[PDB]
Amino acid sequence: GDVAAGASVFSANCAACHMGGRNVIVANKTLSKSDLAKYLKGFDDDAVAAVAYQVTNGKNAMPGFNGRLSPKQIEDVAAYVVDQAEKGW
Template identity: 35%
Template structure:
């Protein structure tokens, strides 16, 4: 019994999707409606491109997480829809993608 449980646990850990896969899915579900490929269909200058993030003071994971959590202007707050962990993952994902020019 324990041998089967150990094998199943190892398989789950070995074949678990990478962390970015969850972040990608979160972004696609919650963010891509307005921010396709890091753009912004609502407000042109408020993109998730690195230059715009820098100009608007969102250069850290914490700063990005704060706007995801609390929203601002046309941006909805997600504190009631996402966990703190999901918000942190999304913020890291946005910063990583911006640093890669959304490729």
């Protein structure tokens, strides 16, 4: 449910710009472990947390989802992202 629900959240909220784990706005900032490690702050420490944080506050071109998603929904989707990034989309 954690990861499995994150999938739902993802298609409904993230797939627009992160189809297939890519990045339709800023090309080189994708959701691949490689990039996630390179550009996400604190990704090596706590992957999920790092992602979750980003999702919550947004960044540059990327809006945050603080009001839109429940904390749970955010954990779930971050968890999904990490899990998907580990296998390679």
